[PDB]
Structures are given as C-alpha cells and as structure tokens.
Amino acid sequence: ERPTFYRQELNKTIWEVPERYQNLSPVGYGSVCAAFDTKTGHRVAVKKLSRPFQSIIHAKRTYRELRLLKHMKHENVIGLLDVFTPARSLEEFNDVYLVTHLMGADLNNIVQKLTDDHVQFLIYQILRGLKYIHSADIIHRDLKPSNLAVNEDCELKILDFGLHTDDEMTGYVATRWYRAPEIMLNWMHYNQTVDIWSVGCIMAELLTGRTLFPGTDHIDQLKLILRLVGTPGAELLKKISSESARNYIQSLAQMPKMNFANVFIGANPLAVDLLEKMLVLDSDKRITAAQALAHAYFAQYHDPDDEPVADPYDQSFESRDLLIDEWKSLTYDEVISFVPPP
Numbered sequence: 001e002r003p004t005f006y007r008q009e010l011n012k013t014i015w016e017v018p019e020r021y022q023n024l025s026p027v028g029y030g031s032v033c034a035a036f037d038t039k040t041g042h043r044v045a046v047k048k049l050s051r052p053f054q055s056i057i058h059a060k061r062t063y064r065e066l067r068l069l070k071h072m073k074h075e076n077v078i079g080l081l082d083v084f085t086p087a088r089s090l091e092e093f094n095d096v097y098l099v100t101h102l103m104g105a106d107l108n109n110i111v112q113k114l115t116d117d118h119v120q121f122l123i124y125q126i127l128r129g130l131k132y133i134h135s136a137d138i139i140h141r142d143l144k145p146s147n148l149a150v151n152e153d154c155e156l157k158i159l160d161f162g163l164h165t166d167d168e169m170t171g172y173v174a175t176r177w178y179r180a181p182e183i184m185l186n187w188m189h190y191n192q193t194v195d196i197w198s199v200g201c202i203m204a205e206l207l208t209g210r211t212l213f214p215g216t217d218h219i220d221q222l223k224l225i226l227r228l229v230g231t232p233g234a235e236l237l238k239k240i241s242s243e244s245a246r247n248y249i250q251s252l253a254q255m256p257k258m259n260f261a262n263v264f265i266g267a268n269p270l271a272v273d274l275l276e277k278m279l280v281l282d283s284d285k286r287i288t289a290a291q292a293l294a295h296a297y298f299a300q301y302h303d304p305d306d307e308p309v310a311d312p313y314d315q316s317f318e319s320r321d322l323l324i325d326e327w328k329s330l331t332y333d334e335v336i337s338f339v340p341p342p
C-alpha cells in the first residue's frame with residue numbers, strides 16, 4: 001500500500017514526504033534535510049533532487065545515481081534506506097527523494113592526534129570498501145577526506161561517488177590534490193587503479209598531518225609528484241597517448257625516486273612499504289585493494305572470511321542513447337521496485 005504523504009514548505013522549498021519521516025530540518029544538485037525515521041529509528045538525511053529530468057544529460061545522471069545507490073550493500077559504503085516519489089503514476093512523475101543514514105563528521109572534522117593504530121583501522125576500512133566497489137567494476141574516481149564519513153568509534157563509510165568541471169579543478173584546490181596523474185592530465189584511458197593512488201595520498205596525510213601534493217595548479221602538482229616518485233621511463237612513456245603530453249614530460253630533467261623512509265620520518269616501516277606500493281606512477285604496477293588487505297600493516301584487522309565482494313553490476317546503460325522521457329521511465333521503474341534492507 002502507498003503511504004500517506006504530507007506537505008510543507010521549508011526554506012522556500014516544498015517537501016512532500018511519507019508520514020514516517022518527522023521533524024525535518026534543512027542542512028544544505030539538490031536540497032537536503034535531516035529527519036527522524038519512525039519506522040527504523042535512525043536519524044536520516046533526505047535529499048530532494050533538483051531538476052532531475054531537465055535534459056538528456058541530467059535525466060541519465062539521475063538514473064545513474066539511483067542505480068549505483070540501489071546496488072551498494074556493504075558496511076564501509078553509503079547505502080540506500082529508501083527512495084520515494086509523491087507521484088501516483090508515470091504521467092505525473094516529477095520529483096525524486098533519496099534517504100540514507102545521517103552522517104555528522106568527515107575525515108577532515110576528525111583529523112585529533114592519530115596513533116598508528118588509528119591509521120591502520122581507517123585505511124583498512126577504505127580498502128575493504130574499495131575491494132567491494134572494484135569487484136563490481138565500479139570506479140569511485142573522487143576519493144578524498146571530505147568524501148569519507150567517520151563516527152565516534154572510528155568507523156568509516158565511503159560516499160559521494162563520481163557521477164567535476166574544468167573550473168572546479170583549477171588552482172590551489174583540494175578537488176585535485178588526491179587525483180592520479182594519468183587522469184589529472186588526460187594521459188590515457190584510466191581504470192580502477194586511480195582509486196589506489198588516492199588512498200596513498202590520504203594515508204600519507206593521516207601520518208604527517210599535511211597534504212601530500214598541494215599543487216597551486218596542474219603543472220606545479222605534477223612537479224611535486226615527479227620529485228617524490230621519479231620521472232617516467234620509456235616503458236610508461238609508451239602508454240601516454242598524447243604526443244604533446246609525451247613531449248612535455250620529456251622536457252623535464254630526469255629525477256630518481258626518493259627514499260620514502262627519509263620523507264615519512266619516524267613512520268612504521270610497514271606503513272612506508274605500503275605507501276611505496278600504492279604511489280607508483282605506472283598504474284599497471286600499483287597494488288590492488290585485494291592485495292593491500294593482505295599486507296602485514298593490517299595484520300591485526302585482516303580477516304579473509306569477512307571481506308566480501310559485490311553482486312555483478314550491469315552498466316550497459318552507460319553506452320545507450322535514449323530520449324529524456326525514456327530515461328525518466330527507467331528511473332520511475334527503479335523507484336517503484338525498491339525493496340528496503342532488513
């Protein structure tokens with residue numbers, strides 16, 4: 001049976017939601033409210049999408065977000081508690097609302113004086129969630145401290161999957177400091193190995209308290225990266241598709257890889273070893289999430305019987321060309337077929 005909905009205007013926005021959601025309070029693409037869910041007892045975040053079907057690009061993006069959130073079922077990844085529309089039919093369908101557990105602090109708000117044990121547990125949880133994500137052939141693309149939610153018990157969830165413009169990535173900006181060089185400069189077709197570079201940048205910052213590659217622009221950032229990991233050899237240069245990018249790289253004086261024990265002074269030697277395996281310029285040679293979980297740095301947390309993989313995820317829609325109303329109808333079907341978690 002369809003629940004009873006109630007209407008209210010909050011901060012010049014109309015919200016029409018099921019009675020189960022009470023005490024709505026604005027907190028922040030879309031608009032977001034905190035609420036109390038009387039069915040589950042959780043405090044929740046409720047997001048009303050802004051203009052979900054205003055263009056082919058926007059309609060496909062709405063479908064993409066709903067498909068991804070419906071699939072993710074893992075302790076270290078954001079999940080979907082509910083999705084609803086007040087519409088009674090496809091003909092009157094206009095608005096989409098998404099519901100998840102309310103999170104209060106990200107990794108920035110946490111990072112305290114972190115012990116090495118704290119770094120072990122936080123990085124372990126990122127890699128456990130990434131093993132799951134990558135097993136479904138999903139690439140996050142935007143891992144950074146503001147996209148990692150952390151609670152009082154140091155438990156962590158990955159959120160805000162890549163679903164960013166040129167201006168957003170320009171200058172002295174945290175939106176670029178965690179990106180792998182091959183994607184920052186469009187060197188080649190990237191893959192899931194981009195996320196491991198980001199994990200290395202995050203782990204370094206938890207150990208030192210400082211951003212690893214805080215470049216003032218794309219070129220300054222590349223210079224900081226190459227000073228640490230070395231300039232590329234002929235093997236990697238062959239993999240860069242742009243002749244212009246290859247010519248630029250070859251204009252730089254050659255540099256050896258630095259000694260990571262003299263950069264990360266005083267850190268656990270096992271942490272230093274893991275950083276050397278994540279921060280490798282050639283993405284083909286980086287450690288994977290599944291391999292990293294078995295590294296000795298995580299010995300007190302690793303349990304191979306409690307590191308699950310995902311159900312298969314069909315992304316064939318990404319190469320499909322449809323009209324606005326066809327993306328809209330596919331989205332409607334996914335709203336009405338949602339089954340809540342236990």
Ligand SMILES: O[C@@H](c1ccccc1)[C@@H]1N(CC2CC2)[C@H]2CC[C@]1(O)CC2
Nearest residue numbers: 032045046047098099100101102103160
């Ligand atoms: O996109 C928002 C969202 C809300 C409800 C369901 C699904 C997604 C997401 N929420 C997640 C809330 C759990 C904390 C926050 C505001 C913007 C943000 O992008 C990142 C932090």
Ligand SMILES: [Cl-]
Nearest residue numbers: 003018019020
């Ligand atoms: Cl209800």
Ligand SMILES: [Cl-]
Nearest residue numbers: 087093094095
């Ligand atoms: Cl509607």
Ligand SMILES: [Cl-]
Nearest residue numbers: 144145146174
């Ligand atoms: Cl950030």
Ligand SMILES: [Cl-]
Nearest residue numbers: 252253254255
């Ligand atoms: Cl040289």
Ligand SMILES: [Cl-]
Nearest residue numbers: 312313314315
């Ligand atoms: Cl699927």
Ligand SMILES: [Mg+2]
Nearest residue numbers: 146147159160
């Ligand atoms: Mg974010």
